[PDB]
Amino acid sequence: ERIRDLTSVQGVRENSLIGYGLVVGLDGTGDQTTQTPFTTQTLNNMLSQLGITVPTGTNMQLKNVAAVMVTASYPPFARQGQTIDVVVSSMGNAKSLRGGTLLMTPLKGVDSQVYALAQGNILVGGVQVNQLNGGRITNGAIIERELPTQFGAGNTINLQLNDEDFTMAQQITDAINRARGYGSATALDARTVQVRVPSGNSSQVRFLADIQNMEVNVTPQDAKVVINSRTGSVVMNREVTLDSCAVAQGNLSVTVGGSLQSVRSSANLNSVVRALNALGATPMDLMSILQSMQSAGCLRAKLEII
Amino acid sequence: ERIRDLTSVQGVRENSLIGYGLVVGLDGTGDQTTQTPFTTQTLNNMLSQLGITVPTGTNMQLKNVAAVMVTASYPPFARQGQTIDVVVSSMGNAKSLRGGTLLMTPLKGVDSQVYALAQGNILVGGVQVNQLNGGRITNGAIIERELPTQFGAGNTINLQLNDEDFTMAQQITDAINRARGYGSATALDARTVQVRVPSGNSSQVRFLADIQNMEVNVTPQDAKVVINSRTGSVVMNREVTLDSCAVAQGNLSVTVGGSLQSVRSSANLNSVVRALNALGATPMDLMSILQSMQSAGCLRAKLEII
Amino acid sequence: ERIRDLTSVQGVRENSLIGYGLVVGLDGTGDQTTQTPFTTQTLNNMLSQLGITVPTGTNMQLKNVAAVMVTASYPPFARQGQTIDVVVSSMGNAKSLRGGTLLMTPLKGVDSQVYALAQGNILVGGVQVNQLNGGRITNGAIIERELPTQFGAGNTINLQLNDEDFTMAQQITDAINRARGYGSATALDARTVQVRVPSGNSSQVRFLADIQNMEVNVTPQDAKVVINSRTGSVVMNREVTLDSCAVAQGNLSVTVGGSLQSVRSSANLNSVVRALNALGATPMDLMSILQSMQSAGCLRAKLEII
Amino acid sequence: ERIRDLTSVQGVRENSLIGYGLVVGLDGTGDQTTQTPFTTQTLNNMLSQLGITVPTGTNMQLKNVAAVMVTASYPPFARQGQTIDVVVSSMGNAKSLRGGTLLMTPLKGVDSQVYALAQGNILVGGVQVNQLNGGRITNGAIIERELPTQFGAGNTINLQLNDEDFTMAQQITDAINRARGYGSATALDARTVQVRVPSGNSSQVRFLADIQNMEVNVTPQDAKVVINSRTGSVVMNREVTLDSCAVAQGNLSVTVGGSLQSVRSSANLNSVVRALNALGATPMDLMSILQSMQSAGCLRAKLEII
């Protein structure tokens, strides 16, 4: 696996942008403004900013405008000329956003500063039906401000691991130590590896580029079972080991001569799958069987309800 | 890939224009002015600007006029004689904009200055039905003001990368360094490359023209999976690697002998596709299976809900 | 079994994050705001933070917004640039969260400090139906604060065992003592093993990485039976031993010549399963039979109602 | 039988944790808050702790939240980083807890101190129907405080027997005396055995580990019959002896020539079963027959109504 596939850089981080705006067009299917006054209020605010002053007492029963919230994603090292994608989601009573247009929404971050301006056409999908109050605009926001970053300062860069592991951190440190000279990398914990980098933006970029594509062997992570129980999904890891036991579950019986099937000890994932398949059960029954076994041991893994 | 296909220029940036206007004609299907007084108010304002003063107390039940918002796109280095396309979207209660005409809308930017004037005929499309409250006018706006730009000043131009990558930035810098002499380009971060350019508009334009068409080999970007879950779409990258595991999902069973299918370790995208296809599942089930696996590792990629 | 599969590290611990937020989009199926005023109140608070001040007296009957609680999981040694998964669960009257979007929720820990900010798109599953008021966002929260940790201090690390056992702790201590020199590890109790580690983050990480993958033979844990009685599941351990007895249960009779079946003494799990299967009973009857036997001895194991 | 299978250690004891919390999601099927005001009150308390102050006069008719009680199990020698399973049970009017999520419940012991914090996803089972107002979370609570224990102090450890017996205590003491030197173990009563242990945590752990796996022959415990009479179960011990008698029960007659069957003297459990089976009776009749015989002697065992 490449280093980039399991590790992020300390200075490279993403930021979240939010904003409020209006979507026009829509072929009807807009907000019922009698229940969403803020749509009309913000439309009037925009019109006043453009040069039209609507009288205070007005019906304002328009159905081609929907008030929406836009979520963006400030990319690392973003420049002013860059364009980023945005997600537009209806707020009030809008039935659909099929062919609407966003109107210059100023996107704001955690520090309440306008970082981008979003405007574009919504794309939504055409029984599993599509979500038609939520759309995406590709390159629908233009950045206006730059985050001051500390990349290229000092001489230590923290490669931050995903899915923390002392062994994986040691493997990454050793791989970098073989590639470069002695003392190039040093593991700080199960998640961070400090690499000594020369001063200067260019040389740091070159070193990170060389490091990122580098291949590292992945040690066996952990015996882990994932039970969702909300989407009816069960996933078992490669290192999951199963211990000999006996399981009895409602309405289940041996094929053949009754209930209380036996489960054999199995050190391989294929053997674990075969043993759990001999115990004929649906995934819904499988979750209960797995939890009951884990309560008694009998399952050499940790199961997480996800 | 050409440099232009993955990189923008620092001085070359796009601006967003907005405006409010009226669309006339429409074969009925206009605004219900009893619920949208601003349509009548702005029509009266336009008539007064033309020389007709409507009395204050009037019925104003006209159905051939629709109040619309126009969105434009100020192109880089735009001149006064240029014409740009605009998007016209209904505001109030208009049923359609099939054959309407826009009436000299002054388009405004973020700094509230009129940059273009938009006037033209709307084009809209003729069960998947077309959006007939949203249209486009080709060359429907004429520019009137020029943005002061800093292009051609100094001696450093920032080639700004899309889809930030330290390796891609290093590749671009190295390619430019091979093409030109030493020190021509220098990577500043994962997204910016500073190229040293001679003074003068003509020589900067020549250098950028020569650089833009240049071919650069694209390194493997990243193992990444995209799940939309709103349009029912799943996309997997070329570098997505799949680790051996066992997956159980509701109503799914081995073809053949029951639930809890096995997924083999696979380092190739074709092998990943084959392994996930042996697990017979619809895309809706595939999203849940992929998320559950990623929770347990078992999927050597990062998945983003888009 | 690997040491990592049955032991956690003292400094490596997980923390729980909580937060409150809003989900927008949803294709209707949102909160009935007449019964959940806090949804509208917090939406108004967010709008005021963005720059829109809704009047106090408003209908606020919007059905595209659902108030939700987000639960996160602060990983050990977490860095600021890291992203973690979150679980979004509806609070009020929301019918579904099929295609919603979370809006910058500040996640808080036990000490009431904001540790992460959560924003992303909800994924929910497509008779066993899926839970559609509960979803998960993968990498849907970005960390903002770092827990001060004491890892890499002192010279003693406590390997903490899961499923406490004096014999297992002694086995782990002995295995480490064979691998390293004398006095490297010392068992403190049935659950803790103190390993002497050299000073420094790098060397502690290296020692823990070497120790974690190490194989240790697992002694027979304990004779234990698990009865759930809520999911209808019975699990029996490998060490469960069965003593000779006679059992009579309602509507059960010998196959063949009446009630009061006999159960033979059996020192093997397979023989125990055969003896309990000769007594033809469903798991529901099996729980009562097992509890009744345990009341009389006759069952060389402890049974837990789980 | 291993010593661990019939004996607990004096210092090793379990503690019970309790807590109150909320479960969110649930696909409706939550509390009817008009009859359970405490659900809304505690939700408002949590929101205030998060930063949202609901007005005092509110409808609060939300059906996605259920007030629950969580029961945990503080394991012996528990550390701060450990995770333990919890049981979540509905309190008010909740119809189900199918896919809910627990929200940071502080678990409390007998001394009213917070010992763990519980948060996670509930797992419940999918005519014998499952209990869907009661679920379990695996590793759903993280410990925060450590019980001060006296293990490793003094030089005497009390092996405490389950199912008290003077003969079993003597057998355990003799077995330890053969394994170690003279005076190693001394029986104090029918339930306690004092073993002399050297000072120090490490040596006490080693001695207990060596002792725990040791095999000891189990003497015949006692002639005992268990009648449940609530689940219709009758269990008879291995030492149950039956004396010659005559029994008459309603609607029962000799197969063949009428009522008042004879029961032969029988010193073996198989012979006892045969004698009671010749008397053709259902378990319900068997309980009455056994109690009536025991009133007259005729049954060389003690019967307990369980």
Side-chain angles (χ1 to χ4, degrees):
Chain A
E1 211 156 359
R2 303 184 201 269
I3 301 283
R4 61 160 64 232
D5 269 322
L6 73 165
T7 284
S8 80
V9 189
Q10 175 195 352
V12 181
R13 70 151 284 162
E14 191 214 9
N15 290 256
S16 281
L17 302 180
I18 206 170
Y20 168 87
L22 288 179
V23 160
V24 290
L26 297 191
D27 264 334
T29 75
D31 282 19
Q32 281 86 313
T33 50
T34 61
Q35 287 70 240
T36 45
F38 53 70
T39 307
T40 48
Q41 165 180 348
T42 58
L43 183 87
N44 279 356
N45 198 321
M46 200 156 257
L47 285 186
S48 74
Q49 293 264 80
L50 294 171
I52 298 97
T53 305
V54 181
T56 71
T58 43
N59 191 357
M60 294 298 102
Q61 272 184 342
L62 73 164
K63 64 192 71 93
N64 287 348
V65 175
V68 296
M69 292 275 318
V70 287
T71 62
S73 61
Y74 200 87
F77 300 127
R79 290 280 99 95
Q80 292 180 357
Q82 310 273 4
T83 53
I84 61 172
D85 312 335
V86 298
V87 175
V88 180
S89 306
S90 169
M91 263 179 67
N93 297 295
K95 204 252 171 173
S96 172
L97 305 179
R98 176 80 66 185
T101 304
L102 192 68
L103 297 172
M104 293 177 70
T105 287
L107 289 153
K108 306 212 212 273
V110 300
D111 62 48
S112 55
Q113 285 185 118
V114 174
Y115 274 100
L117 181 87
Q119 154 162 302
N121 296 285
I122 318 295
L123 196 157
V124 309
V127 177
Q128 293 81 20
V129 75
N130 308 283
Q131 173 69 243
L132 71 173
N133 293 114
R136 198 181 173 88
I137 319 174
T138 303
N139 308 320
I142 298 169
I143 302 168
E144 318 273 357
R145 194 171 320 191
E146 301 216 0
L147 294 174
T149 58
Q150 293 145 50
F151 172 78
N155 285 104
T156 51
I157 287 171
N158 288 356
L159 287 193
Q160 306 159 344
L161 273 75
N162 314 300
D163 273 18
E164 69 275 16
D165 213 38
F166 285 108
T167 73
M168 201 46 38
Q170 189 60 38
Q171 278 289 308
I172 290 182
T173 304
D174 293 26
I176 298 169
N177 276 352
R178 319 169 212 140
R180 295 291 185 269
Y182 181 77
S184 282
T186 289
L188 299 170
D189 52 277
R191 194 172 273 257
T192 309
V193 174
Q194 191 178 75
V195 292
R196 204 181 81 280
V197 297
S199 291
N201 270 358
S202 182
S203 196
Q204 286 204 4
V205 162
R206 181 194 266 89
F207 194 30
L208 286 184
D210 183 308
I211 290 304
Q212 269 210 328
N213 314 97
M214 185 180 288
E215 51 275 20
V216 59
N217 299 114
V218 179
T219 64
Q221 285 171 349
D222 189 359
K224 181 158 61 182
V225 184
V226 165
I227 288 160
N228 189 178
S229 80
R230 277 189 309 226
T231 61
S233 184
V234 171
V235 168
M236 301 165 78
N237 212 1
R238 199 180 101 88
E239 291 266 90
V240 168
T241 300
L242 183 62
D243 190 74
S244 166
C245 68
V247 292
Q249 185 87 33
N251 277 11
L252 301 188
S253 69
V254 183
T255 302
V256 173
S259 75
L260 193 61
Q261 297 95 0
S262 276
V263 176
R264 272 169 34 80
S265 180
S266 54
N268 318 108
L269 180 58
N270 299 284
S271 57
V272 166
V273 169
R274 189 161 35 249
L276 283 185
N277 281 346
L279 162 74
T282 65
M284 271 295 138
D285 291 331
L286 200 54
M287 311 175 176
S288 297
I289 289 169
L290 283 162
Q291 192 174 7
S292 288
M293 294 183 286
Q294 189 261 353
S295 286
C298 298
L299 172 70
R300 311 319 295 149
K302 74 183 291 273
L303 62 84
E304 293 179 353
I305 319 301
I306 301 299
Chain B
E1 211 156 359
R2 303 184 201 269
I3 301 283
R4 61 160 64 232
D5 269 322
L6 73 165
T7 285
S8 80
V9 189
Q10 175 195 352
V12 181
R13 70 151 284 162
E14 191 214 9
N15 290 256
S16 281
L17 302 180
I18 206 170
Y20 168 87
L22 288 179
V23 160
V24 290
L26 297 191
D27 264 334
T29 75
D31 282 19
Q32 281 86 313
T33 50
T34 61
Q35 287 70 240
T36 45
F38 53 70
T39 307
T40 48
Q41 165 180 348
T42 58
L43 183 87
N44 279 356
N45 198 321
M46 200 156 257
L47 285 186
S48 74
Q49 293 264 80
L50 294 171
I52 298 97
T53 305
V54 181
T56 71
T58 43
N59 191 357
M60 294 298 102
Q61 272 184 162
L62 73 164
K63 64 192 71 93
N64 287 348
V65 175
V68 296
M69 292 275 318
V70 287
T71 62
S73 61
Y74 200 86
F77 300 127
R79 290 280 99 95
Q80 292 180 357
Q82 310 273 4
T83 53
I84 61 172
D85 313 335
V86 298
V87 175
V88 180
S89 306
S90 169
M91 263 179 67
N93 297 295
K95 204 252 171 173
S96 172
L97 305 179
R98 176 80 66 185
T101 304
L102 192 68
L103 297 172
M104 293 177 70
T105 287
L107 289 153
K108 306 212 212 273
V110 300
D111 62 48
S112 55
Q113 285 185 118
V114 174
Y115 274 100
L117 181 87
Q119 154 162 302
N121 296 285
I122 318 295
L123 196 157
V124 309
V127 177
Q128 293 81 20
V129 75
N130 308 283
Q131 173 69 243
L132 71 173
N133 293 114
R136 198 181 174 88
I137 319 174
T138 303
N139 308 320
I142 298 169
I143 302 168
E144 318 273 357
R145 194 171 321 191
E146 301 215 0
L147 294 174
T149 58
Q150 293 145 50
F151 172 78
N155 285 104
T156 51
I157 287 171
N158 288 356
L159 287 193
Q160 306 159 344
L161 273 75
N162 314 300
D163 273 18
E164 69 275 16
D165 213 38
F166 285 108
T167 73
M168 201 46 38
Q170 189 60 38
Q171 278 289 308
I172 290 182
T173 304
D174 293 27
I176 298 169
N177 276 352
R178 319 169 212 140
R180 295 291 185 269
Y182 181 77
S184 282
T186 289
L188 299 170
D189 52 277
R191 194 172 273 257
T192 309
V193 174
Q194 191 177 75
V195 292
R196 204 181 81 280
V197 297
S199 291
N201 270 357
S202 182
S203 196
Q204 286 204 4
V205 162
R206 181 194 266 89
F207 194 30
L208 286 184
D210 183 308
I211 290 304
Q212 269 210 328
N213 314 97
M214 185 179 288
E215 51 275 20
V216 59
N217 299 114
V218 179
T219 64
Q221 286 171 349
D222 189 359
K224 180 158 61 182
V225 184
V226 165
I227 288 160
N228 189 178
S229 80
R230 277 189 309 226
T231 61
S233 184
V234 171
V235 168
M236 301 165 78
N237 212 1
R238 199 180 101 88
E239 291 266 90
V240 168
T241 300
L242 183 62
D243 190 74
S244 166
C245 68
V247 292
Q249 185 87 33
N251 277 11
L252 301 188
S253 69
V254 183
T255 302
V256 173
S259 75
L260 193 61
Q261 297 95 0
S262 276
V263 176
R264 272 169 34 80
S265 180
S266 54
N268 318 108
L269 180 58
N270 299 284
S271 57
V272 166
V273 169
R274 189 161 35 249
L276 282 185
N277 281 346
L279 162 74
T282 65
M284 271 295 138
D285 291 331
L286 200 54
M287 311 175 176
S288 297
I289 289 169
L290 283 162
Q291 192 174 7
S292 288
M293 294 183 286
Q294 189 261 353
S295 286
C298 298
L299 172 70
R300 311 319 295 149
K302 74 183 291 273
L303 62 84
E304 293 179 353
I305 319 301
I306 301 299
Chain C
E1 211 156 359
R2 303 184 201 269
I3 301 283
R4 61 160 64 232
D5 269 322
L6 73 165
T7 284
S8 80
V9 189
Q10 175 195 352
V12 181
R13 70 151 284 163
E14 191 214 9
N15 290 256
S16 281
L17 302 180
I18 206 170
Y20 168 87
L22 288 179
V23 160
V24 290
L26 297 191
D27 264 334
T29 75
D31 282 19
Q32 281 86 313
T33 50
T34 61
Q35 287 70 240
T36 45
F38 53 71
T39 307
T40 48
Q41 165 180 348
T42 58
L43 183 87
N44 279 356
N45 198 321
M46 200 156 257
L47 285 186
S48 74
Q49 293 264 80
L50 294 171
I52 298 97
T53 305
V54 181
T56 71
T58 43
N59 192 357
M60 294 298 102
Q61 272 184 162
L62 73 164
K63 64 192 71 93
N64 287 348
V65 175
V68 296
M69 292 275 318
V70 287
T71 62
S73 61
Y74 201 87
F77 300 127
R79 290 280 99 95
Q80 292 180 357
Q82 310 273 4
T83 53
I84 61 172
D85 312 335
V86 298
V87 175
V88 180
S89 306
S90 169
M91 263 179 67
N93 297 295
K95 204 252 171 173
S96 172
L97 305 179
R98 176 80 66 185
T101 304
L102 192 68
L103 297 172
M104 293 177 70
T105 286
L107 289 153
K108 306 212 212 273
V110 300
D111 62 48
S112 55
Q113 285 185 118
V114 174
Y115 274 100
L117 181 87
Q119 154 162 302
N121 296 285
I122 318 295
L123 196 157
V124 309
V127 177
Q128 293 81 20
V129 75
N130 308 283
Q131 173 69 243
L132 71 173
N133 293 114
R136 198 181 174 88
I137 319 174
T138 303
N139 308 320
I142 298 169
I143 302 168
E144 318 273 357
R145 194 171 321 191
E146 301 215 0
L147 294 174
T149 58
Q150 293 145 50
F151 172 78
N155 285 104
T156 51
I157 287 171
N158 288 356
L159 287 193
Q160 306 159 345
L161 273 75
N162 314 300
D163 273 18
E164 69 275 16
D165 213 38
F166 285 108
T167 73
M168 201 46 38
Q170 189 60 38
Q171 278 289 308
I172 290 182
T173 305
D174 293 26
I176 298 169
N177 276 352
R178 319 169 212 140
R180 295 291 185 269
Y182 181 77
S184 281
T186 289
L188 299 170
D189 52 277
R191 194 172 273 257
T192 309
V193 174
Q194 191 177 75
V195 292
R196 204 181 81 280
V197 297
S199 291
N201 270 358
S202 182
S203 196
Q204 286 204 4
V205 162
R206 181 194 266 89
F207 194 30
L208 286 184
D210 183 308
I211 290 304
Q212 269 210 328
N213 314 97
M214 185 180 288
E215 51 275 20
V216 59
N217 299 114
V218 179
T219 64
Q221 286 171 349
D222 189 359
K224 180 158 61 182
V225 184
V226 165
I227 288 160
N228 189 178
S229 80
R230 277 189 309 226
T231 62
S233 184
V234 171
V235 168
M236 301 165 78
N237 212 1
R238 199 180 101 88
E239 291 266 90
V240 168
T241 300
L242 183 63
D243 190 74
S244 166
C245 68
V247 292
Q249 185 87 33
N251 277 11
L252 301 188
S253 69
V254 183
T255 302
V256 173
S259 75
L260 193 61
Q261 297 95 0
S262 276
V263 176
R264 272 169 34 80
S265 180
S266 54
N268 318 108
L269 180 58
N270 299 284
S271 57
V272 166
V273 169
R274 189 161 35 249
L276 283 185
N277 281 346
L279 162 74
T282 65
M284 271 295 138
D285 291 331
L286 200 54
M287 311 175 176
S288 297
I289 289 169
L290 283 162
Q291 192 174 7
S292 288
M293 294 183 286
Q294 189 261 353
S295 286
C298 298
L299 172 70
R300 311 319 295 149
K302 74 183 291 273
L303 62 84
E304 293 179 353
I305 319 301
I306 301 299
Chain D
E1 211 156 359
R2 303 184 201 269
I3 301 283
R4 61 160 64 232
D5 269 322
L6 73 165
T7 285
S8 80
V9 189
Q10 175 195 352
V12 181
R13 70 151 284 162
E14 191 214 9
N15 290 256
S16 281
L17 302 180
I18 206 170
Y20 168 87
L22 288 179
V23 160
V24 290
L26 297 191
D27 264 334
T29 75
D31 282 19
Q32 281 86 313
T33 50
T34 61
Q35 287 70 240
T36 45
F38 53 71
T39 307
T40 48
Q41 165 180 349
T42 58
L43 183 87
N44 279 356
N45 198 321
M46 200 156 257
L47 285 186
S48 74
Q49 293 264 80
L50 294 171
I52 298 97
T53 305
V54 181
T56 71
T58 43
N59 192 357
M60 294 298 102
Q61 272 184 162
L62 73 165
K63 64 192 71 93
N64 287 348
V65 175
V68 296
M69 292 275 318
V70 287
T71 62
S73 61
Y74 200 87
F77 300 127
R79 290 280 99 95
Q80 292 180 357
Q82 310 273 4
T83 53
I84 61 172
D85 312 335
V86 298
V87 175
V88 180
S89 306
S90 169
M91 263 179 67
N93 297 295
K95 204 252 171 173
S96 172
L97 305 179
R98 176 80 66 185
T101 304
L102 192 68
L103 297 172
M104 293 177 70
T105 287
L107 289 153
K108 306 212 212 273
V110 300
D111 62 48
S112 55
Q113 285 185 118
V114 174
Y115 274 100
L117 181 87
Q119 154 162 302
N121 296 285
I122 318 295
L123 196 158
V124 309
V127 177
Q128 293 81 20
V129 75
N130 308 283
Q131 173 69 243
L132 71 173
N133 293 114
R136 198 181 173 88
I137 319 174
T138 303
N139 308 321
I142 298 169
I143 302 168
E144 318 273 357
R145 194 171 321 191
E146 301 216 0
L147 294 174
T149 58
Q150 293 145 50
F151 172 78
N155 285 104
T156 51
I157 287 171
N158 288 356
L159 287 193
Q160 306 159 344
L161 273 75
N162 314 300
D163 273 18
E164 69 275 16
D165 213 38
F166 285 108
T167 73
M168 201 46 38
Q170 189 60 38
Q171 278 289 308
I172 290 182
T173 304
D174 293 27
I176 298 169
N177 276 352
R178 319 169 212 140
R180 295 291 185 269
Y182 181 77
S184 282
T186 289
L188 299 170
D189 52 277
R191 194 172 273 257
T192 309
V193 174
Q194 191 178 75
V195 292
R196 204 181 81 280
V197 297
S199 291
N201 270 357
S202 182
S203 196
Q204 286 204 4
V205 162
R206 181 194 266 89
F207 194 30
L208 286 184
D210 183 308
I211 290 304
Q212 269 210 328
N213 314 97
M214 185 180 288
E215 51 275 20
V216 59
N217 299 114
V218 179
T219 64
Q221 286 171 349
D222 189 359
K224 180 158 61 182
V225 184
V226 165
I227 288 160
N228 189 178
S229 80
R230 277 189 309 226
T231 61
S233 184
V234 171
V235 168
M236 301 165 78
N237 212 1
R238 199 180 101 88
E239 291 266 90
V240 168
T241 300
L242 183 62
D243 190 74
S244 166
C245 68
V247 292
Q249 185 87 33
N251 277 11
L252 301 188
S253 69
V254 183
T255 302
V256 173
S259 75
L260 193 61
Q261 297 95 0
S262 276
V263 176
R264 272 169 34 80
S265 180
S266 54
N268 318 108
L269 180 58
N270 299 284
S271 57
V272 166
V273 169
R274 189 161 35 249
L276 283 185
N277 282 346
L279 162 74
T282 65
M284 271 295 138
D285 291 331
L286 200 54
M287 311 175 176
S288 297
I289 289 169
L290 283 162
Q291 192 174 7
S292 288
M293 294 183 286
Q294 189 261 353
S295 286
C298 298
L299 172 70
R300 311 319 295 149
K302 74 183 291 273
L303 62 84
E304 293 179 353
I305 319 301
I306 301 299

